[PDB]
Amino acid sequence: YFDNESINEDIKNYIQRRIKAYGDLRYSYLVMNKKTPLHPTIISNYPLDWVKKYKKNSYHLIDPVILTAKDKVAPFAWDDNSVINKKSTDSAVFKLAREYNIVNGYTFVLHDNSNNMATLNISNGSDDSISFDESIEINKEKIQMLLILTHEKMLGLYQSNSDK
Amino acid sequence: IIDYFDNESINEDIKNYIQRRIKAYGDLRYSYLVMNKKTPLHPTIISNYPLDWVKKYKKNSYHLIDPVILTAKDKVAPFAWDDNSVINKKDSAVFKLAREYNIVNGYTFVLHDNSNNMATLNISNGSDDSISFDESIEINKEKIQMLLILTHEKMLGLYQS
């Protein structure tokens, strides 16, 4: 269920420390399990009103990047054909995200053996587009590993907390 | 929905795809092993391991008792075969038999997909120098993980129904 505010604070802490090495960016680490679909865990520096609105309306159920990630193992851009396709069918999430300047970005995806899907979603925000996309592309293997090691760390911390 | 990964022409093309890329990290032994976690009896194996070892491993379903496969099942991050999680599993029959093929030192990279598959990329220096090998894997582990991801992504697209 991943409700432990204290572990999630160390995870957010672990991500922010390492993710700033690829630039000053917005990120969201979002973890969902099929057994608790309306309570995804979100660990992010996105604007809080957007996060709250996203949680309150269960927007992960209609979010083109999350719907695409279900079918992926490899990272993808939000202007990839698969996301554009889903956007044409339901555009609500991107239309509302535009207010908070969440427009262009990338999603990294991970499935585990506990029925979780984990995503690391990254956006520049309002900043200039080209240098961001080119930094993400040159560093995509490293960012994938950060998602992998964040998720391992998270599962590890929840494992120790449950033992004690 | 995904089909069984059993077209010989496709698997040989994917073998060439892996082999050309993984040789950037040294002269090494590799096995790409994909296993369905619901029905795990008959995994797909694309490998340059010694053919007699591969044949023996398939005939005896050794993945079911292989410490690195049993470890990968509960992992998302790569691990060395001397890591504490693997030594715990070490039934040691698989490693004892593998030693006769110089397959002693190695790493496993793992990937769970959304079709109940677990894909692993297992790599070993065989009889070549273990120090150079370990250093090359340690500094290239992010690229090797991405090689597994892109290989599996290709397989998923090729076998999609």
Ligand SMILES: CCCC(=O)CC(=O)N[C@H]1CCOC1=O
């Ligand atoms: C609030 C966290 C939302 C996510 O973690 C997924 C995500 O980043 N979706 C993007 C797509 C466009 O607007 C978003 O928020």
Ligand SMILES: CCCC(=O)CC(=O)N[C@H]1CCOC1=O
């Ligand atoms: C024949 C392919 C076997 C594998 O793909 C898994 C693997 O590499 N297991 C290692 C562990 C020690 O001996 C092995 O063969």
